[PDB]
CSV table of C-alpha atoms in Angstrom, one decimal:
chain,number,residue,atom,x,y,z
W,1,UNK,CA,203.7,77.8,130.5
W,2,UNK,CA,201.2,79.0,127.5
W,3,UNK,CA,203.0,80.1,124.1
W,4,UNK,CA,201.1,80.8,120.9
W,5,UNK,CA,203.3,79.9,117.9
W,6,UNK,CA,202.3,81.7,115.0
W,7,UNK,CA,202.9,81.0,111.2
W,8,UNK,CA,203.2,84.3,109.4
W,9,UNK,CA,200.8,84.5,106.5
W,10,UNK,CA,201.9,83.8,102.8
W,11,UNK,CA,204.0,85.4,100.8
W,12,UNK,CA,204.9,84.9,97.1
W,13,UNK,CA,207.2,82.0,97.5
W,14,UNK,CA,204.9,79.8,99.7
W,15,UNK,CA,202.6,79.2,96.1
W,16,UNK,CA,206.1,79.4,94.3
W,17,UNK,CA,207.5,76.2,96.5
W,18,UNK,CA,210.7,78.2,97.3
W,19,UNK,CA,212.6,78.1,100.7
W,20,UNK,CA,212.1,81.2,102.5
W,21,UNK,CA,214.4,82.4,105.5
W,22,UNK,CA,215.7,85.1,105.6
W,23,UNK,CA,215.1,86.5,102.2
W,24,UNK,CA,212.9,90.0,103.3
W,25,UNK,CA,209.5,89.3,101.4
W,26,UNK,CA,206.5,91.0,102.0
W,27,UNK,CA,203.4,89.4,102.9
W,28,UNK,CA,200.5,89.1,99.8
W,29,UNK,CA,197.0,90.7,99.6
W,30,UNK,CA,195.9,87.1,101.0
W,31,UNK,CA,199.0,86.8,103.6
W,32,UNK,CA,197.4,89.9,104.8
W,33,UNK,CA,193.8,88.5,104.7
W,34,UNK,CA,195.1,85.6,106.9
W,35,UNK,CA,197.0,88.1,109.3
W,36,UNK,CA,193.7,90.2,109.9
W,37,UNK,CA,191.5,86.9,110.8
W,38,UNK,CA,193.7,85.8,113.7
W,39,UNK,CA,193.0,89.1,115.4
W,40,UNK,CA,189.9,87.4,116.1
W,41,UNK,CA,191.2,84.3,117.9
W,42,UNK,CA,194.7,85.2,119.7
W,43,UNK,CA,194.8,85.6,123.5
W,44,UNK,CA,196.4,89.4,124.4
W,45,UNK,CA,199.8,87.9,125.8
W,46,UNK,CA,202.8,89.9,125.8
W,47,UNK,CA,203.7,89.9,121.9
W,48,UNK,CA,207.2,88.7,120.3
W,49,UNK,CA,208.0,88.6,116.9
W,50,UNK,CA,211.0,88.0,114.1
W,51,UNK,CA,212.0,91.2,113.1
W,52,UNK,CA,212.0,89.6,109.0
W,53,UNK,CA,208.9,92.0,107.7
W,54,UNK,CA,206.0,89.4,107.1
W,55,UNK,CA,206.1,88.4,110.6
W,56,UNK,CA,206.4,91.9,112.0
W,57,UNK,CA,203.6,92.7,109.8
W,58,UNK,CA,201.4,89.7,110.5
W,59,UNK,CA,201.7,90.7,114.1
W,60,UNK,CA,200.7,94.1,113.1
W,61,UNK,CA,197.4,93.2,111.3
W,62,UNK,CA,196.6,90.5,113.8
W,63,UNK,CA,196.5,93.5,116.3
W,64,UNK,CA,199.8,93.2,118.1
W,65,UNK,CA,202.8,95.2,119.1
W,66,UNK,CA,206.0,92.6,119.3
W,67,UNK,CA,209.0,93.0,121.4
W,68,UNK,CA,211.9,91.8,118.1
W,69,UNK,CA,214.0,89.2,118.2
W,70,UNK,CA,216.0,87.9,115.6
W,71,UNK,CA,216.3,84.4,117.6
W,72,UNK,CA,212.6,84.1,115.9
W,73,UNK,CA,213.7,84.3,112.6
W,74,UNK,CA,213.3,81.0,109.9
W,75,UNK,CA,216.7,79.0,109.6
W,76,UNK,CA,219.0,80.8,107.2
W,77,UNK,CA,219.0,79.1,103.9
W,78,UNK,CA,222.4,80.6,102.5
W,79,UNK,CA,222.6,79.9,99.0
W,80,UNK,CA,219.4,77.9,99.1
W,81,UNK,CA,217.1,81.3,99.6
W,82,UNK,CA,214.6,81.0,97.0
W,83,UNK,CA,215.2,77.7,95.6
W,84,UNK,CA,212.5,75.5,94.4
W,85,UNK,CA,211.9,72.6,96.8
W,86,UNK,CA,211.1,70.6,93.6
W,87,UNK,CA,214.7,70.8,92.3
W,88,UNK,CA,216.8,70.9,95.5
W,89,UNK,CA,219.6,67.9,95.4
W,90,UNK,CA,218.1,64.5,97.3
W,91,UNK,CA,220.4,65.1,100.1
W,92,UNK,CA,218.7,68.3,100.8
W,93,UNK,CA,215.1,67.1,100.7
W,94,UNK,CA,216.0,64.1,102.5
W,95,UNK,CA,217.6,66.4,105.4
W,96,UNK,CA,214.5,68.9,105.5
W,97,UNK,CA,212.1,66.0,105.6
W,98,UNK,CA,214.2,63.9,108.6
W,99,UNK,CA,214.9,67.6,110.1
W,100,UNK,CA,218.6,66.6,110.2
W,101,UNK,CA,221.8,67.0,108.6
W,102,UNK,CA,221.1,70.0,106.8
W,103,UNK,CA,223.7,72.7,106.3
W,104,UNK,CA,223.2,75.2,103.5
W,105,UNK,CA,226.5,76.9,101.9
W,106,UNK,CA,226.2,80.4,103.6
W,107,UNK,CA,223.7,79.3,105.8
W,108,UNK,CA,222.7,78.1,109.3
W,109,UNK,CA,222.9,74.6,110.1
W,110,UNK,CA,219.6,73.1,111.2
W,111,UNK,CA,221.2,72.5,114.7
W,112,UNK,CA,222.5,75.7,114.8
W,113,UNK,CA,219.1,76.9,114.4
W,114,UNK,CA,217.2,74.7,116.9
W,115,UNK,CA,219.7,75.9,119.2
W,116,UNK,CA,219.0,79.7,118.2
W,117,UNK,CA,215.2,79.2,118.9
W,118,UNK,CA,215.3,77.1,122.2
W,119,UNK,CA,217.4,79.6,123.8
W,120,UNK,CA,215.0,82.3,123.2
W,121,UNK,CA,212.0,79.7,124.3
W,122,UNK,CA,213.7,78.9,127.6
W,123,UNK,CA,214.4,82.3,128.0
W,124,UNK,CA,210.8,83.4,128.3
W,125,UNK,CA,209.8,84.4,131.5
W,126,UNK,CA,205.8,84.6,130.7
W,127,UNK,CA,203.0,83.0,128.4
W,128,UNK,CA,203.6,85.0,124.9
W,129,UNK,CA,202.2,85.4,121.5
W,130,UNK,CA,205.3,84.3,119.1
W,131,UNK,CA,205.0,85.4,115.4
W,132,UNK,CA,207.5,83.4,113.9
W,133,UNK,CA,208.0,80.9,110.5
W,134,UNK,CA,207.4,77.1,109.9
W,135,UNK,CA,210.1,76.3,110.3
W,136,UNK,CA,210.4,77.4,114.0
W,137,UNK,CA,206.7,76.3,114.5
W,138,UNK,CA,207.9,72.6,113.0
W,139,UNK,CA,210.8,72.7,115.7
W,140,UNK,CA,208.7,73.3,118.5
W,141,UNK,CA,206.2,71.0,117.5
W,142,UNK,CA,208.8,68.2,117.0
W,143,UNK,CA,210.0,68.8,120.3
W,144,UNK,CA,206.9,68.1,121.7
W,145,UNK,CA,206.6,64.9,119.9
W,146,UNK,CA,204.1,66.0,117.1
W,147,UNK,CA,204.2,66.7,113.7
W,148,UNK,CA,205.2,70.5,112.5
W,149,UNK,CA,203.9,71.3,109.3
W,150,UNK,CA,201.2,74.4,109.7
W,151,UNK,CA,199.8,76.7,107.1
W,152,UNK,CA,200.8,80.1,106.8
W,153,UNK,CA,199.0,82.3,108.9
W,154,UNK,CA,197.7,79.5,111.3
W,155,UNK,CA,198.8,79.1,114.9
W,156,UNK,CA,199.3,76.3,117.3
W,157,UNK,CA,198.9,77.0,121.6
W,158,UNK,CA,201.2,74.7,123.0
W,159,UNK,CA,201.9,74.0,127.3
W,160,UNK,CA,205.8,74.5,126.9
W,161,UNK,CA,207.7,72.6,127.4
W,162,UNK,CA,205.1,69.8,128.1
W,163,UNK,CA,202.5,69.3,125.2
W,164,UNK,CA,200.2,70.9,122.7
W,165,UNK,CA,197.2,72.7,123.6
W,166,UNK,CA,195.6,72.9,120.1
W,167,UNK,CA,195.9,74.1,117.1
W,168,UNK,CA,194.1,76.7,114.9
W,169,UNK,CA,193.8,77.0,111.4
W,170,UNK,CA,191.3,78.7,109.6
T,1,UNK,CA,204.5,78.6,141.9
T,2,UNK,CA,201.8,80.1,144.3
T,3,UNK,CA,202.1,83.7,144.3
T,4,UNK,CA,199.9,85.9,145.9
T,5,UNK,CA,199.5,89.8,144.8
T,6,UNK,CA,198.0,92.5,146.4
T,7,UNK,CA,196.9,95.7,145.0
T,8,UNK,CA,197.7,98.6,148.0
T,9,UNK,CA,194.9,100.2,149.0
T,10,UNK,CA,193.5,103.5,147.3
T,11,UNK,CA,195.4,106.8,147.3
T,12,UNK,CA,193.8,110.3,146.1
T,13,UNK,CA,194.7,109.7,142.5
T,14,UNK,CA,192.1,106.8,142.1
T,15,UNK,CA,189.2,108.9,142.6
T,16,UNK,CA,190.6,111.7,140.7
T,17,UNK,CA,191.6,109.1,137.8
T,18,UNK,CA,194.9,110.3,137.0
T,19,UNK,CA,197.9,107.9,136.2
T,20,UNK,CA,200.1,106.8,139.4
T,21,UNK,CA,203.2,105.6,138.9
T,22,UNK,CA,206.3,106.4,140.6
T,23,UNK,CA,204.9,109.6,142.0
T,24,UNK,CA,205.0,108.4,145.6
T,25,UNK,CA,201.7,109.1,147.4
T,26,UNK,CA,200.4,108.1,150.6
T,27,UNK,CA,197.1,106.0,151.3
T,28,UNK,CA,193.9,107.8,151.6
T,29,UNK,CA,192.0,106.9,155.1
T,30,UNK,CA,190.1,104.6,153.4
T,31,UNK,CA,193.2,103.3,151.5
T,32,UNK,CA,194.5,102.3,155.1
T,33,UNK,CA,190.7,100.9,156.1
T,34,UNK,CA,191.8,98.2,153.1
T,35,UNK,CA,194.9,97.5,154.1
T,36,UNK,CA,194.0,96.7,157.5
T,37,UNK,CA,191.2,94.3,156.5
T,38,UNK,CA,193.6,92.3,154.5
T,39,UNK,CA,195.4,91.4,158.0
T,40,UNK,CA,194.4,87.9,158.2
T,41,UNK,CA,192.9,87.2,155.1
T,42,UNK,CA,196.5,86.4,152.9
T,43,UNK,CA,198.7,83.5,153.7
T,44,UNK,CA,201.6,83.7,156.2
T,45,UNK,CA,204.6,83.6,153.3
T,46,UNK,CA,207.9,85.4,152.9
T,47,UNK,CA,206.4,88.7,151.8
T,48,UNK,CA,208.3,91.4,149.3
T,49,UNK,CA,206.8,94.6,148.6
T,50,UNK,CA,207.2,97.6,146.0
T,51,UNK,CA,209.2,100.5,147.9
T,52,UNK,CA,206.7,103.1,147.2
T,53,UNK,CA,204.9,104.2,150.3
T,54,UNK,CA,201.4,103.1,149.3
T,55,UNK,CA,202.7,99.5,149.0
T,56,UNK,CA,205.2,99.5,152.3
T,57,UNK,CA,202.2,100.8,154.1
T,58,UNK,CA,199.4,98.6,152.8
T,59,UNK,CA,202.0,95.6,153.5
T,60,UNK,CA,202.5,97.0,157.2
T,61,UNK,CA,198.8,97.5,157.7
T,62,UNK,CA,198.0,93.7,156.7
T,63,UNK,CA,201.1,92.4,159.4
T,64,UNK,CA,204.1,91.8,157.2
T,65,UNK,CA,207.4,93.0,157.0
T,66,UNK,CA,208.3,92.6,153.5
T,67,UNK,CA,211.9,93.2,151.7
T,68,UNK,CA,211.8,96.2,149.5
T,69,UNK,CA,212.1,95.7,145.7
T,70,UNK,CA,211.5,98.5,143.3
T,71,UNK,CA,211.1,95.7,140.8
T,72,UNK,CA,207.6,95.8,142.0
T,73,UNK,CA,206.6,99.0,141.4
T,74,UNK,CA,204.2,100.2,139.3
T,75,UNK,CA,205.1,101.1,135.6
T,76,UNK,CA,207.0,104.7,135.4
T,77,UNK,CA,204.8,106.4,133.5
T,78,UNK,CA,207.4,109.4,132.8
T,79,UNK,CA,205.9,112.5,131.6
T,80,UNK,CA,202.6,110.9,132.0
T,81,UNK,CA,202.4,111.1,135.8
T,82,UNK,CA,200.0,112.3,137.3
T,83,UNK,CA,197.8,113.2,133.8
T,84,UNK,CA,194.0,112.7,134.1
T,85,UNK,CA,193.6,109.3,132.1
T,86,UNK,CA,190.4,111.0,130.7
T,87,UNK,CA,192.6,113.4,128.8
T,88,UNK,CA,195.3,111.2,127.3
T,89,UNK,CA,196.1,111.5,123.5
T,90,UNK,CA,194.4,108.7,121.7
T,91,UNK,CA,197.8,106.9,121.2
T,92,UNK,CA,198.2,106.9,124.8
T,93,UNK,CA,194.8,105.6,125.9
T,94,UNK,CA,194.2,102.9,122.9
T,95,UNK,CA,198.2,101.7,124.3
T,96,UNK,CA,197.2,101.6,127.6
T,97,UNK,CA,193.6,99.7,126.8
T,98,UNK,CA,195.0,97.1,125.0
T,99,UNK,CA,198.0,96.9,127.0
T,100,UNK,CA,200.8,97.3,124.2
T,101,UNK,CA,203.0,99.5,122.4
T,102,UNK,CA,203.4,102.2,125.3
T,103,UNK,CA,206.3,104.6,125.0
T,104,UNK,CA,205.9,107.5,127.7
T,105,UNK,CA,208.5,110.1,127.0
T,106,UNK,CA,210.7,109.9,130.1
T,107,UNK,CA,209.4,107.0,131.4
T,108,UNK,CA,209.3,102.8,130.9
T,109,UNK,CA,207.8,101.1,127.8
T,110,UNK,CA,205.2,98.8,128.9
T,111,UNK,CA,207.5,95.9,127.1
T,112,UNK,CA,210.3,97.0,129.7
T,113,UNK,CA,207.9,97.2,132.4
T,114,UNK,CA,206.9,93.7,131.6
T,115,UNK,CA,210.4,92.4,131.5
T,116,UNK,CA,211.0,93.9,134.9
T,117,UNK,CA,207.9,92.3,136.6
T,118,UNK,CA,208.8,88.9,135.0
T,119,UNK,CA,212.2,88.7,136.0
T,120,UNK,CA,211.5,89.5,139.1
T,121,UNK,CA,208.7,86.9,139.4
T,122,UNK,CA,211.1,84.2,137.5
T,123,UNK,CA,213.7,84.9,140.7
T,124,UNK,CA,211.4,83.9,143.2
T,125,UNK,CA,212.4,80.6,145.0
T,126,UNK,CA,209.4,79.9,146.8
T,127,UNK,CA,205.4,80.8,147.5
T,128,UNK,CA,205.2,84.6,148.8
T,129,UNK,CA,202.9,87.5,149.0
T,130,UNK,CA,203.8,90.3,147.0
T,131,UNK,CA,202.8,94.0,147.8
T,132,UNK,CA,202.5,95.7,144.6
T,133,UNK,CA,200.6,98.4,142.2
T,134,UNK,CA,197.5,97.6,140.2
T,135,UNK,CA,199.7,97.6,136.7
T,136,UNK,CA,201.7,95.2,138.0
T,137,UNK,CA,198.7,92.8,138.7
T,138,UNK,CA,197.2,93.8,135.6
T,139,UNK,CA,200.3,92.4,133.9
T,140,UNK,CA,200.1,89.1,135.5
T,141,UNK,CA,196.6,88.6,135.0
T,142,UNK,CA,196.5,89.5,131.4
T,143,UNK,CA,199.8,87.4,131.0
T,144,UNK,CA,197.3,84.7,132.2
T,145,UNK,CA,194.9,85.1,129.6
T,146,UNK,CA,192.5,86.9,132.0
T,147,UNK,CA,191.0,90.4,132.7
T,148,UNK,CA,193.3,92.0,134.9
T,149,UNK,CA,191.7,94.9,136.9
T,150,UNK,CA,191.0,94.4,140.3
T,151,UNK,CA,190.3,96.8,143.3
T,152,UNK,CA,193.0,98.7,145.7
T,153,UNK,CA,193.5,97.0,148.4
T,154,UNK,CA,192.3,93.2,146.9
T,155,UNK,CA,194.3,90.8,146.2
T,156,UNK,CA,194.8,87.5,143.6
T,157,UNK,CA,196.7,84.3,144.1
T,158,UNK,CA,198.3,82.1,140.8
T,159,UNK,CA,199.9,79.3,140.5
T,160,UNK,CA,203.1,81.4,138.4
T,161,UNK,CA,203.4,81.0,135.6
T,162,UNK,CA,200.2,78.9,134.7
T,163,UNK,CA,196.9,80.1,135.9
T,164,UNK,CA,195.0,82.2,138.4
T,165,UNK,CA,193.7,80.2,141.5
T,166,UNK,CA,191.7,82.7,143.6
T,167,UNK,CA,190.5,86.4,143.3
T,168,UNK,CA,189.9,87.9,146.8
T,169,UNK,CA,188.0,91.0,147.4
T,170,UNK,CA,186.9,92.8,150.9
T,171,UNK,CA,184.1,95.2,151.9
């Protein structure tokens, strides 16, 4: 079943290199421009979106009116929200790289995060466009055996749960 | 899974251009003619149909004895029921055109409509013929990435939830 995973436009923490999870940052001017460009590429399928501002605004600027689901949120980094990726304790860097064994204080475990994301995905009953976050897109791509890193404001279409259909980066 | 969806025959509000949702209108003479032409053109599979008259009657004239399900009904337009499409406020016109963010007072939102329709399709265990409405066919075709408008009394076959197989219209 066709699903479009869209990573929201950039926020200030993207250029700053800070972990961005449940901190509700707005899009930058460029992030808004990225969202607008998506209007000319994304298919008009039922839309869903993380309830965080940056995702909602990306959906809006891309020409969609999404049903909001917190299950589509990026992982909650807890005390690590806003932390510079460069200064993270090696244990955290390692976990984020290998995509396993990550449980920030006051946040969600990478395991609970994935459980939340896939429960949502398996619940879908028709093709859809999903406005979400880098970590969510990464989880889905890795589940299909692919590298999950995609730029802000870009998207990847997948034939869930079989394979990746195409990547779209502007 | 192979599913055949049939848009019921025309009613007076088709030529009139009025939003027809849960208003239970009958088929016109031409509407019955369209339904009769479907007999012998649709596959022999279990049949399901919206419980609204126009749909049930289409199924009947097409040679089927479907189990009735309100879940196959057209979207509930609420206060907009019977409204001339031509005179709808821009917000509603655009919402229906772009098939998104439609919240009619006293009716069903497009999101609620889609959830209802898709939940029903998910429950189907095997191939079947579904006698339904223009909006339902439109939601399905659009979800499959194609233009969703089809003529009254016409049908489409899809491999749900993957692709459209064929569109069938008769004269």
